[PDB]
Amino acid sequence: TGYDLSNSVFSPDGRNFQVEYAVKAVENGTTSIGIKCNDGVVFAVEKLITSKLLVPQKNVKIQVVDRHIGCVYSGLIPDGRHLVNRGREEAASFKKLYKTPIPIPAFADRLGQYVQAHTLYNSVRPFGVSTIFGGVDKNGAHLYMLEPSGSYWGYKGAATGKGRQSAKAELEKLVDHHPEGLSAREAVKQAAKIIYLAHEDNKEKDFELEISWCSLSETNGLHKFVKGDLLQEAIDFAQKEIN
Amino acid sequence: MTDRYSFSLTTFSPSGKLGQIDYALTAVKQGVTSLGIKATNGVVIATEKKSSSPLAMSETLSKVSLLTPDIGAVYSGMGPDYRVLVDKSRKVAHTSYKRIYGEYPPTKLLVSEVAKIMQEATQSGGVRPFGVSLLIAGHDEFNGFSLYQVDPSGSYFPWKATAIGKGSVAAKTFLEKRWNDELELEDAIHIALLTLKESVEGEFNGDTIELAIIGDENPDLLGYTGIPTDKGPRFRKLTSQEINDRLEAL
Amino acid sequence: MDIILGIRVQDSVILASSKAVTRGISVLKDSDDKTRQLSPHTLMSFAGEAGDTVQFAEYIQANIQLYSIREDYELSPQAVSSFVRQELAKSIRSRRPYQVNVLIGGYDKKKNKPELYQIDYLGTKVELPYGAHGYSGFYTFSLLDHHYRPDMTTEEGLDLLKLCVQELEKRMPMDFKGVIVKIVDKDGIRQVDDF
Amino acid sequence: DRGVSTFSPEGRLFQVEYSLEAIKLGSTAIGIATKEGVVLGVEKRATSPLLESDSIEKIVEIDRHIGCAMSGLTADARSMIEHARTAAVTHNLYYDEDINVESLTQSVCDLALRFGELMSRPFGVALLIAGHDADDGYQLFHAEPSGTFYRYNAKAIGSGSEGAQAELLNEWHSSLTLKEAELLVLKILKQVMEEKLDENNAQLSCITKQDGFKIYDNEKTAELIKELKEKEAAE
Amino acid sequence: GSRRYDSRTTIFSPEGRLYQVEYALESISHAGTAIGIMASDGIVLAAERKVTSTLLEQDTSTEKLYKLNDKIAVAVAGLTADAEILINTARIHAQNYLKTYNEDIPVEILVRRLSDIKQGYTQHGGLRPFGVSFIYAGYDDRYGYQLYTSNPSGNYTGWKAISVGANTSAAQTLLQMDYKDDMKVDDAIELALKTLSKTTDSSALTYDRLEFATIRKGANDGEVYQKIFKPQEIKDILVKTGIT
Amino acid sequence: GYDRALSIFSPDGHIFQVEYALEAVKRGTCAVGVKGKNCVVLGCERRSTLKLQDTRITPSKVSKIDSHVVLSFSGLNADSRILIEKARVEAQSHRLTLEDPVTVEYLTRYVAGVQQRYTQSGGVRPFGVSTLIAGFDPRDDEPKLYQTEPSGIYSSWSAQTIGRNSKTVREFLEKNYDRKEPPATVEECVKLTVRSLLEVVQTGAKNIEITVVKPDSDIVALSSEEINQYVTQIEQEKQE
Amino acid sequence: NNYDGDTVTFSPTGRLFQVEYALEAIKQGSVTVGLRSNTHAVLVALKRNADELSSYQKKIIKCDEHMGLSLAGLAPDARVLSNYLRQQCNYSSLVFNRKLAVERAGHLLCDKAQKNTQSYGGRPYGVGLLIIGYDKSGAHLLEFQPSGNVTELYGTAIGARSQGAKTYLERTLDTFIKIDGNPDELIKAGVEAISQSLRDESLTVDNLSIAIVGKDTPFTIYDGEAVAKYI
Amino acid sequence: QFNPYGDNGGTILGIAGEDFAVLAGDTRNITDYSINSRYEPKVFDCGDNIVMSANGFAADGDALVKRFKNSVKWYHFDHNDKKLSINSAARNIQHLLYGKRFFPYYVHTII
Amino acid sequence: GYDRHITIFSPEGRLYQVEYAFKATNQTNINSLAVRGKDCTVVISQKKVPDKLLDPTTVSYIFCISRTIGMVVNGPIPDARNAALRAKAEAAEFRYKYGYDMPCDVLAKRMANLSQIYTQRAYMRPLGVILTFVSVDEELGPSIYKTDPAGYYVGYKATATGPKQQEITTNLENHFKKSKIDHINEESWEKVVEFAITHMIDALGTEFSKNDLEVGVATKDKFFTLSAENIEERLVAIAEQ
Numbered sequence A: 001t002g003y004d005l006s007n008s009v010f011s012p013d014g015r016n017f018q019v020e021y022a023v024k025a026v027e028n029g030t031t032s033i034g035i036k037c038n039d040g041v042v043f044a045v046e047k048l049i050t051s052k053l054l055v056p057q058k059n060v061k062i063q064v065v066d067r068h069i070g071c072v073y074s075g076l077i078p079d080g081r082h083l084v085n086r087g088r089e090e091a092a093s094f095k096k097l098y099k100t101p102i103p104i105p106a107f108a109d110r111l112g113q114y115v116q117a118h119t120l121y122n123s124v125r126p127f128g129v130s131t132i133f134g135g136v137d138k139n140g141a142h143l144y145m146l147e148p149s150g151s152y153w154g155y156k157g158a159a160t161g162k163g164r165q166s167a168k169a170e171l172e173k174l175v176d177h178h179p180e181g182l183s184a185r186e187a188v189k190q191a192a193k194i195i196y197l198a199h200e201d202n203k204e205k206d207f208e209l210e211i212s213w214c215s216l217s218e219t220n221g222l223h224k225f226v227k228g229d230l231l232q233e234a235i236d237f238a239q240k241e242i243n
Numbered sequence B: 001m002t003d004r005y006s007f008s009l010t011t012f013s014p015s016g017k018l019g020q021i022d023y024a025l026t027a028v029k030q031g032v033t034s035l036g037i038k039a040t041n042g043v044v045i046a047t048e049k050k051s052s053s054p055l056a057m058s059e060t061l062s063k064v065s066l067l068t069p070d071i072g073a074v075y076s077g078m079g080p081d082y083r084v085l086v087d088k089s090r091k092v093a094h095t096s097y098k099r100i101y102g103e104y105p106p107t108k109l110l111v112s113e114v115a116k117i118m119q120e121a122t123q124s125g126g127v128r129p130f131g132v133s134l135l136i137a138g139h140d141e142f143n144g145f146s147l148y149q150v151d152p153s154g155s156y157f158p159w160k161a162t163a164i165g166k167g168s169v170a171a172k173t174f175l176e177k178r179w180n181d182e183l184e185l186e187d188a189i190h191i192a193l194l195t196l197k198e199s200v201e202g203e204f205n206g207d208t209i210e211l212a213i214i215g216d217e218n219p220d221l222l223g224y225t226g227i228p229t230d231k232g233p234r235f236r237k238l239t240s241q242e243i244n245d246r247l248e249a250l
Numbered sequence C: 001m002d003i004i005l006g007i008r009v010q011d012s013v014i015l016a017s018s019k020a021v022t023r024g025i026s027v028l029k030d031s032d033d034k035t036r037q038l039s040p041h042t043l044m045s046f047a048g049e050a051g052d053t054v055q056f057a058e059y060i061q062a063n064i065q066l067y068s069i070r071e072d073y074e075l076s077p078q079a080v081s082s083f084v085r086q087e088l089a090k091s092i093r094s095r096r097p098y099q100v101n102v103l104i105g106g107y108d109k110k111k112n113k114p115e116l117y118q119i120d121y122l123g124t125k126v127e128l129p130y131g132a133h134g135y136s137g138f139y140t141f142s143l144l145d146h147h148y149r150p151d152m153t154t155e156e157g158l159d160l161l162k163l164c165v166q167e168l169e170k171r172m173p174m175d176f177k178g179v180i181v182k183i184v185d186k187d188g189i190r191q192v193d194d195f
Numbered sequence D: 001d002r003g004v005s006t007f008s009p010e011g012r013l014f015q016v017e018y019s020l021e022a023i024k025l026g027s028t029a030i031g032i033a034t035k036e037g038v039v040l041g042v043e044k045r046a047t048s049p050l051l052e053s054d055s056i057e058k059i060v061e062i063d064r065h066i067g068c069a070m071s072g073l074t075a076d077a078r079s080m081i082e083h084a085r086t087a088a089v090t091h092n093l094y095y096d097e098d099i100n101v102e103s104l105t106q107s108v109c110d111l112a113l114r115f116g117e118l119m120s121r122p123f124g125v126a127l128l129i130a131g132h133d134a135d136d137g138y139q140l141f142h143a144e145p146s147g148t149f150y151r152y153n154a155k156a157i158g159s160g161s162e163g164a165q166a167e168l169l170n171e172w173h174s175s176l177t178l179k180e181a182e183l184l185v186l187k188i189l190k191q192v193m194e195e196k197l198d199e200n201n202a203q204l205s206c207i208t209k210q211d212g213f214k215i216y217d218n219e220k221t222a223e224l225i226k227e228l229k230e231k232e233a234a235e
Numbered sequence E: 001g002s003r004r005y006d007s008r009t010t011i012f013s014p015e016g017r018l019y020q021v022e023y024a025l026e027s028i029s030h031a032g033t034a035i036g037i038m039a040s041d042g043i044v045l046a047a048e049r050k051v052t053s054t055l056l057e058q059d060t061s062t063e064k065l066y067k068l069n070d071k072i073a074v075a076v077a078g079l080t081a082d083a084e085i086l087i088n089t090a091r092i093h094a095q096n097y098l099k100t101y102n103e104d105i106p107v108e109i110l111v112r113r114l115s116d117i118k119q120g121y122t123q124h125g126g127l128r129p130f131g132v133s134f135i136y137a138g139y140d141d142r143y144g145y146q147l148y149t150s151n152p153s154g155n156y157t158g159w160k161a162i163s164v165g166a167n168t169s170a171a172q173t174l175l176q177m178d179y180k181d182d183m184k185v186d187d188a189i190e191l192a193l194k195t196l197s198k199t200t201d202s203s204a205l206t207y208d209r210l211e212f213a214t215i216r217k218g219a220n221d222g223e224v225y226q227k228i229f230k231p232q233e234i235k236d237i238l239v240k241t242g243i244t
Numbered sequence F: 001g002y003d004r005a006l007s008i009f010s011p012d013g014h015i016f017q018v019e020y021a022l023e024a025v026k027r028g029t030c031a032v033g034v035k036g037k038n039c040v041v042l043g044c045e046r047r048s049t050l051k052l053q054d055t056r057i058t059p060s061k062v063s064k065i066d067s068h069v070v071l072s073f074s075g076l077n078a079d080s081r082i083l084i085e086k087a088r089v090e091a092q093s094h095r096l097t098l099e100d101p102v103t104v105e106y107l108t109r110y111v112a113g114v115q116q117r118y119t120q121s122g123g124v125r126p127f128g129v130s131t132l133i134a135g136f137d138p139r140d141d142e143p144k145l146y147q148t149e150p151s152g153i154y155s156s157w158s159a160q161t162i163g164r165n166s167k168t169v170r171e172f173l174e175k176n177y178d179r180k181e182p183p184a185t186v187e188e189c190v191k192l193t194v195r196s197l198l199e200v201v202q203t204g205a206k207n208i209e210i211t212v213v214k215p216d217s218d219i220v221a222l223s224s225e226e227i228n229q230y231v232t233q234i235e236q237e238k239q240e
Numbered sequence G: 001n002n003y004d005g006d007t008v009t010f011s012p013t014g015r016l017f018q019v020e021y022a023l024e025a026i027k028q029g030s031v032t033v034g035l036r037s038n039t040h041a042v043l044v045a046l047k048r049n050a051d052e053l054s055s056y057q058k059k060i061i062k063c064d065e066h067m068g069l070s071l072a073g074l075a076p077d078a079r080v081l082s083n084y085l086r087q088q089c090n091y092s093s094l095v096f097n098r099k100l101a102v103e104r105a106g107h108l109l110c111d112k113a114q115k116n117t118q119s120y121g122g123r124p125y126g127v128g129l130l131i132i133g134y135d136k137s138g139a140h141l142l143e144f145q146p147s148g149n150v151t152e153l154y155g156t157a158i159g160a161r162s163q164g165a166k167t168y169l170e171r172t173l174d175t176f177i178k179i180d181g182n183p184d185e186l187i188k189a190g191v192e193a194i195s196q197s198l199r200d201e202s203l204t205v206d207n208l209s210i211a212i213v214g215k216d217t218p219f220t221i222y223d224g225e226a227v228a229k230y231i
Numbered sequence H: 001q002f003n004p005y006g007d008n009g010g011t012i013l014g015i016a017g018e019d020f021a022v023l024a025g026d027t028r029n030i031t032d033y034s035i036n037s038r039y040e041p042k043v044f045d046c047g048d049n050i051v052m053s054a055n056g057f058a059a060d061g062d063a064l065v066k067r068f069k070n071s072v073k074w075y076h077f078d079h080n081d082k083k084l085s086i087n088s089a090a091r092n093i094q095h096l097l098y099g100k101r102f103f104p105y106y107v108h109t110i111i
Numbered sequence I: 001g002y003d004r005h006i007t008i009f010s011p012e013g014r015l016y017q018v019e020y021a022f023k024a025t026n027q028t029n030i031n032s033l034a035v036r037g038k039d040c041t042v043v044i045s046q047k048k049v050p051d052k053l054l055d056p057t058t059v060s061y062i063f064c065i066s067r068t069i070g071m072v073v074n075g076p077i078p079d080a081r082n083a084a085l086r087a088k089a090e091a092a093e094f095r096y097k098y099g100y101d102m103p104c105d106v107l108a109k110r111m112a113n114l115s116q117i118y119t120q121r122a123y124m125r126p127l128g129v130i131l132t133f134v135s136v137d138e139e140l141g142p143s144i145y146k147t148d149p150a151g152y153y154v155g156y157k158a159t160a161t162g163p164k165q166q167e168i169t170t171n172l173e174n175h176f177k178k179s180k181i182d183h184i185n186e187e188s189w190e191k192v193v194e195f196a197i198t199h200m201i202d203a204l205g206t207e208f209s210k211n212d213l214e215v216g217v218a219t220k221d222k223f224f225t226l227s228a229e230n231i232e233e234r235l236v237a238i239a240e241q
Ligand SMILES: [Mg+2]
Pocket: I006, I007, I117, I118, I119, I120, I121, I122, I123, I124, I125, I126
């Protein structure tokens, strides 16, 4: 034994235990999700209200990269911010050299390679976050989810955090019941419901819902936060479904 | 990141042993047998092509490698370590000699350079020693024909004939009985084939045996004519057919 | 600075160096000693660009004194001259070269022989019976070529040196304010206080 | 082994806490601040009688208006003093004025936590920095290897510190004269020292606005010791 | 991180010894014996090759005696590969000195330089020391014939006669017994071979198990000659001295 | 580069690498320094375990740093060379920039500073060496004797000893050296230095080295016979 | 246990112990309170002395005319982080002629602290910070943890016994948020909040430290007889 | 070839009274024969009761004033809000100017 | 026992971290196969999409390294993509420096050398992947070259990689023992793909739908991957005889 004391060490199984321990920090975090719709993507996250002293709507969790990509994550929040900062550098250099905004699959690999690099040495620690991200490019909508190992795939729907099992089941129903697809406005409503349903794993404290979206028709392919009436409408739809 | 292993990974133990070098020699002991014999008019180096799978094309894996036109090398131990050492040996023959003196290095000095590289992997920070022993055969104008062994420590010794790897102890005894100072190159090849048969289990033919010589200049392998002083390489790898012809007179 | 002369006789080396320091319009000093003792039996005189001369001489002095302490041994005049040459040869391909010419007068205690070395700022070294830098040789060498003998005494060397200085004082346009003369022999280095 | 910059479960840096133990083994140093000046005193503690005690230099000038006393691994103090002197002189060069005592102290304390895997370990010495400036008058600071510095009306460091500090607790008041402070340092040093206090194994110094930092002669201190003996015998 | 795997090669023990230096000296005690003897008219270097084979090409082989320049040679005891690294550095230093001063490097200055390199590996860098002990045989016009030794600590000392490698305790006692100050080279040749013959772990001392060298002013007039003995020449001197 | 912190504090506030460096000094051959009224004498022990030594060429224990200052030591011999070289370079550097040779105190302060630096720099171990530095300041006739140790602390001494069995010879010096009246002549100072080593040395043959330093760069090492005459006279007075 | 030797090692449950130990240093520190209305933001800090001869350690540091913080934990680490904030505020003013937003200042502190939690050789910061400020979006209060987590709040407290002050602010939330255009009453609420964390000792004239920033109020620190009015 | 310097004209005047001081300057900014601005302030309040003007090349002038204002700010941070005296400000400005000795601020400064 | 944590020798002369990297190679539970035709080189690999929430078009272990070279990977996707990016960069740099397309065997050697370095240098870990490079080389013709975490590489007539490599290997061995030639004697690549799929079905004993497989084909001057509908056409032809 001792194989789990140092990053980048293969165990006799062929496993990197330090990466597996980073996953535990992710599983301890709040629930975040992503839904791929007809012409875009929707992101939503659970924000635990630890105290009344928290200013509502101020501690924003979802982050924009460039102007067309949204990122949300569960686990160690600072680690997620570090990853998004790198992502913003990657996107800037891509656009600098190639002019066009970075495609989503291209952006996915940039984050992937960077996270994977933090599994190669014992002088660094793996990322304690799973990141759900995506947006709209020239080939349409793309949704990705990236793990501490550096592993990522494309998704129809994605979920991570403490209430991921509940969320996944809800996402799987939507895929089955809508083979033709889901509209952007429908996806916002559904995203609100799923976070509310996933909040049962974090039922002790009450929470605040935060939603964002990129859609070709609804936001011109730019990342925007869901605010005001459209947010309230989604909260009402969600509250109606849990009762 | 940064390489933060700036300290030695090979150190002296209380008994005065350098553990990592001893363990590297143990890896060499597990390796497939290779040998070398020096004749009056040439040198021969040989080994078994232990194919990992019959679907594998063992001709694409070269255990016997040309270092310079007059110098060749074979190994026992870890193949990948050997391959990178061959790359470094080929380059250092140019950078530290041919680009300075306009000619290829003599065998003993190229051996000295390879030895230095292997020594440094035994003292430098954050590295392990090379897990190979090399046999280097060559010719040069002023020293004539020569054969050298290089070990993981970086130590090297000249031999009349020797063997390394799996069945080296038995092979060296076999060579002691047969070797004399009047051997012609064909006699040395014959003795090499006889010696190598003892350590080989399965098939023993031109396709499973790799054999090369340092002998006469080969003007047919030079690739050009017109310069009298340039007469071609002395290193030549024997073909599958050439080996089989000498296995009938075995 | 200006005039530096050297002559190797039977048993000693004599170095003569001008006393004037001129900064353009005015003569700022008339008693300047353009020499440094490198070791008990080795003396170096110098001339060239202002500042660089003293900086180079003191740098050499420090290095030879360091060697003397480390080994408890005095380097031969030949060895010191080779060290100085290399430093100047290194300097000539630097970002800003030392613009300094030197004479090295030493008595070799092993061979019991005086030795005079002439080195210019490029690192051009020659061993000579007599030497100079700048225009000094143009006025003095014809006298030295005539009168010089290898078996001359120190007193005869000083007399031949006086004749050289007199010719310089006659035909040179610049007033170099006389010379300080120093003798290097088996007993070490001493200054002739009346010249 | 373990990192040099490692936290303990209590939230303290192991190496910093261990260096504080080295300072406890050091010879005693005492400082007392008054409205007439600040006094600095030290125990020399020679290891042998053949050691010439006037070569023991545990009180040091940083500038004309700032002095300093040390306790612990005194060799470690040399680079700290060098930095302090450089900082004091550099500020005068940049600003044509004296540097504030607090600012000088802060500059020294910035070096403290510059260790890791920069220097390989914290300093094993504590400093009493005393001085005067126009803004805050006479001041005494205690600079630790943690990077923390406290201002004090009076302070003792080294092996006899907690016994001395309790004594300083009772004796200090805001109306002390310079002469009263001198005797008080001598009295408390005499209390905590192993050997009998005299002018050769103890040293006094002060900083005043008029005369600046001054290390006392052995003849001057000898008189103050005789004055102390007589006034203690007076009741 | 990486600290976990660091052996810390440059630390004191509680007794104030350098672990790695001590262990390197233990390694050297198993190496073939090398002996140096200084006489009034020259120096002898004799050394034993380690358990050889009949198929080893002796006439082109060198593991013990190395030329540093025309005036200085070394006998090696320890890791041969480590020795060649230092030997090449010493050869360069000698040439650097010759280029700078236009005089051959004095023996001690070369010895001090190599010894300082060894010292550095014991104080900084975190690398293992060189497992090598040298005997330096040389001549210069200041001190004449000189013998020095250096070991992995970087400490060096001067000697009239000295041994390194295996059985140095036994060898040094034998040398201390028969050595005299007015001794000559031909006598020193005999002493060196007799000492090796008694201290060797082999059954008998033969030409194929030896390396031999002399530094003589037996060079025509006011100069010095180095002679690395050939296999046949070692065979002859063994017969002359009556060992075979 | 190798950055590992080798010298660190322990829970009891000790730096073991520095303390273990002192143990290397304890193992080294004995060195002693005594200052008279107009001189300083440095005595050194030579262990007689090594005969067949060539004494002409073997590194001597006392080293000139400049023409007016000397340095002796106890501990690792190889380590001492690095300190001696640095001290010699600094001595010439001082002459070059200040146009005056180093004071004995300045040279001591420099060497002690180097030793301290090697106790809180990454990737290095402390010097296993203590030094005795003696001489006379330029244009000064007052004798100077200083001591340094691995930690980097230094101080001035009327008389001092370092190395193996230094506890014994310090005992001797503490009862035999009077401060009110130091050895008035060279003879008296050398005699007291040889006497102090005879408490520890063994045979008074080639085991004792003596170096006398007088004002104005007057430094000389005594020969075997000269020292042997002191050894003879001391024991003939002792037979009583 | 086996996983607390350095900051580069996760535990089997995904915890970072060196960061948690750094968090523990804050809990040992002296109590400090932060609270705000819509016009002003206030810091209140209980200063700690070594003994009766010593001074009381300063707790509040000014970063700009419109921003500053209070500390709890390792004071030298607060000096490093506050220096960094001073520089960043300064870069914003010099390059963009723009006062640094308090929210953006929190993001910068988070990222600086994060780098010390993912690399070998370094250590986490051992201090907690309460940042107040007034920018283009009004009054703000931030809480910084050396884990990297920065949070915007109406009110909070950190240090030893900070839970008492935090509960009081949670009750008073609806009252003190409405204290607009009255600096004295907002400070009173802060002094009353920090009083819920005192035991054995009370607020004296050299014990108490108060800072305020607002609409037409530069960041100013009150110490000594300037806080006697609030005792 | 690129010329990194220019001339923006302008004239400034400082006079010290017994218990007061004035620093005056015209508000015209020019290049060659053209007027850039009829009102471009050139004399600045730098805090701590100090006024400053760096006349000549306006880019260098603005840069210097900006850096001095910054130096006043950091003097307060580093030295417990101590007032920067006029003599201390003067010595500080010398170092700001001499820092670019070999690529100078092309201005004539008065405080 | 720190000789098991970093790449230094054990007392038996073994490198345990290298051996454990070979074990990580089978973590995906996917088998791949490569064969050579007259004019082409075909590589097939199992495709498993266990989650319904996944976009199946993004799940792939076959990579287009250059126009001529394809690469299939056996091992975790992060290490796979690490190797893929590096191989692409190396191939592009080669063309820029030396003026011709990097050969398949030369790229294999280069990646094998990089892998060797990770087995000798302590700070770098081995990648837990086996890399099979395929092309139709302009000099050597159809080519299969495979690299592993030990830094070993060799050319192949055909090859197989994964948990059930032995079953596939023996099946291929038996076919080439019959035919007595080093390749599939077939004109079109379509039929060579059909051969590859058929012999994988025989060896594993499992049937495949269009979504269960992943196919890469190398011809002269291009490497390409087949779509699900192209694979379906292949499966139909296999079933109809
Ligand atoms: Mg590795």
